[PDB]
Amino acid sequence: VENLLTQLENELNEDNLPEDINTLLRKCSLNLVTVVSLPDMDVKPLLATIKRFLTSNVSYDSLNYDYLLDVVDKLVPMADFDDVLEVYSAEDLVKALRSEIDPLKVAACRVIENSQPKGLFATSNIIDILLDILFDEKVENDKLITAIEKALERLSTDELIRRRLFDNNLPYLVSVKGRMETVSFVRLIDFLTIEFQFISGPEFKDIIFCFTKEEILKSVEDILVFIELVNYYTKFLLEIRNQDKYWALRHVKKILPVFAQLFEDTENYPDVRAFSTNCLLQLFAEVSRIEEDEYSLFKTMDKDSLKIGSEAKLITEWLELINPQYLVKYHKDVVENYFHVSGYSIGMLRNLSADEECFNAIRNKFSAEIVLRLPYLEQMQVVETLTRYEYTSKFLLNEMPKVMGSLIGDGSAGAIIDLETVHYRNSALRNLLDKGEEKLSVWYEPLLREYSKAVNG
Amino acid sequence: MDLEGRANIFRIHSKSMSVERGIRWELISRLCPNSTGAELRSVCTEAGMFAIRARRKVATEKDFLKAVDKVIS
Write A274-278 long-range contacts (CB < 8 A, 24+).
Answer: A274/B66, A275/A223, A275/A227, A275/B62, A275/B65, A275/B66, A275/B69, A276/A223, A276/A226, A276/A227, A276/A230, A276/B65, A276/B69, A277/B69, A278/B69, A278/B70, A278/B72, A278/B73
Which chain A residues contact residue B72 at CB under 8 A?
278
Closest Cβ–Cβ partner in B4, B62, B69 for A146: B4
Is residue A223 within 8 A of residue A229, CB to CB? The reply is no
Question: Which residues 6+ apart lie within 8 Å of A202 measured at CB?
Answer: none
Alpha carbon A412 to chain centroid, angstroms: 39
Domains detected in chain A: 1-304 (1.25.10.50), 305-457 (1.25.40.580)
Q: In this structure, which amino acid lies at residue B21?
A: R
- Which method resolved this structure? X-ray
Question: Which residues 6+ apart lie within 8 Å of A178 measured at CB?
Answer: none
B69 to A190: CB separation less than 8 angstroms, yes or no:
no
Alpha carbon distance A241, A103 (integer Å):
40
The torsion region of residue A99 among left (phi > 0), alpha (psi -120 to 50) and beta comes to: beta
Alpha carbon distance A117, B56 (integer Å):
55
Is residue B67 within 8 A of residue B47, CB to CB? The reply is yes
Q: How far apart are the first and last CA of chain A?
A: 35
Closest Cβ–Cβ partner in A142, A224, A228 for B7: A142
Write A402-406 long-range contacts (CB < 8 A, 24+).
Answer: A402/A368, A402/A369, A402/A372, A403/A368, A403/A371, A403/A372, A403/A379, A404/A443, A405/A446, A406/A372, A406/A376, A406/A379
Closest CA in chain A for residue B67: A275
Is residue A209 within 8 A of residue A160, CB to CB? The reply is no
φ and ψ at residue A408, rounded to 5 degrees: -95, -95
Is residue A387 within 8 A of residue A393, CB to CB? The reply is yes
Closest Cβ–Cβ partner in A182, A186, A275 for B65: A275
Alpha carbon distance A199, A202 (integer Å):
9
HEC per residue, chain B: CCCCHHHHHHHHHHCCCCECCCCCHHHHHHCCCCCCHHHHHHHHHHHHHHHHHHCCCCECHHHHHHHHHHHCC
Alpha carbon distance B30, A228 (integer Å):
8
Closest CA in chain B for residue A274: B66
Question: Which residues 6+ apart lie within 8 Å of B12 measured at CB?
Answer: none
A190 to B30: CB separation less than 8 angstroms, yes or no:
yes
Q: Which of these, A116, A37, A51, lies nearest to A82 by C-alpha position?
A: A116
Q: Exposed, middle or buried, B7 (CB in 10 Å: 0-12/13-18/19+)?
A: buried
Which chain B residues contact residue A282 at CB under 8 A?
73
Question: Which residues 6+ apart lie within 8 Å of A438 measured at CB?
Answer: none
Q: Dmax over Cα atoms in chain A, in whole Å?
A: 79
HEC per residue, chain A: CHHHHHHHHHHHHHCCCCCCHHHHHHHHHHHHHHCCCCCCCCCHHHHHHHHHHHHCCCCCCCCCHHHHHHHHHCCCCCCCHHHHHHHCCHHHHHHHHHCCCHHHHHHHHHHHHCCCCCCCHHHCCHHHHHHHHHCCCCCCCHHHHHHHHHHHHHHCCCHHHHHHHHCCCHHHHHHHHHHCCHHHHHHHHHHHHHHCCCCCCCCCCCCCCCCCHHHHHHHHHHHHHHHHHHHHHHHHHHHHHHCCCCCHHHCCCCCHHHHHHHHHCCCCCHHHHCCCHHHHHHHHHHHCCCCCCCCHHHHHHHHHCCCCCCCHHHHHHHHHHCCHHHHHHHCHHHHHCCCCCCCCCHHHHHHHCCCHHHHHHHCCCCCHHHHHHCCHHHHHHHHHHHCCCHHHHHHHHCCCHHHHHCCCCCCCHHHCCCHHHHHHHHHHHHHHHCCHHHHCCCCHHHHHHHHHHHHHC
Alpha carbon distance A237, A296 (integer Å):
16
Which chain A residues contact residue B73 at CB under 8 A?
278-279, 281-282
Which chain B residues contact residue A140 at CB under 8 A?
26
Residues of B with CB under 8 A from a CB of A: 2-4, 7, 24, 26-27, 30-31, 61-62, 65-66, 69-70, 72-73
Which chain B residues contact residue A223 at CB under 8 A?
62, 65
Residue A276, chain B, CB below 8 Å: the answer is yes
Q: Which of these, A35, A34, A40, A13, lies nearest to A24 by C-alpha position?
A: A13
Q: How far apart are the first and last CA of chain B?
A: 20
B69 to A275: CB separation less than 8 angstroms, yes or no:
yes
Q: Which of these, A196, A177, A178, lies nearest to A188 by C-alpha position?
A: A177
Alpha carbon B38 to chain centroid, angstroms: 12
Write the CA distances from A64 to A25, A285, B19, integer angstroms: 9, 47, 30
The C-alpha angle with vertex A21 and arms to A16 and A22, in degrees rounded to 5, equals 135
Question: Which residues 6+ apart lie within 8 Å of A310 measured at CB?
Answer: none
Is residue A125 within 8 A of residue A94, CB to CB? The reply is yes
Total Cβ atoms within 10 A of residue A16: 9
Total Cβ atoms within 10 A of residue A53: 17
Is residue A191 within 8 A of residue A153, CB to CB? The reply is no
Beta bridge partner(s), residue B19: B59
Question: Which residues 6+ apart lie within 8 Å of A73 measured at CB?
Answer: A110
Provide the sign of the torsion angle of the four alpha carbons A337, A311, A257, A188, taken in this order: positive
Resolution rounded to one decimal, in angstroms: 3.8
A224 to B7: CB separation less than 8 angstroms, yes or no:
no
Q: Dmax over Cα atoms in chain B, in whole Å?
A: 35
B24 to A183: CB separation less than 8 angstroms, yes or no:
yes
Shortest alpha-carbon distance between residue A223 and chain B (Å): 9
Cα torsion A232, A234, A236, A238 to 10°: value is -140
Alpha carbon distance A372, A374 (integer Å):
6
Provide the residue ranges of all domains of chain B, joining segments of one domain with +: 2-73
Is residue A114 within 8 A of residue A158, CB to CB? The reply is no
Q: Which of these, A103, A110, A19, A108, lies nearest to A53 by C-alpha position?
A: A103
Beta bridge partner(s), residue B59: B19
CATH of B2-73, one of 3.40.50.1240, 1.10.260.40, 1.10.8.60, 3.40.190.10: 1.10.8.60
φ and ψ at residue A160, rounded to 5 degrees: -65, -50
Alpha carbon distance A220, A238 (integer Å):
23
Beta bridge partner(s), residue A246: none
Q: Which of B1, B4, B53, B70 to mutate to test the interface with A (most CBs of A within 10 A)?
A: B4
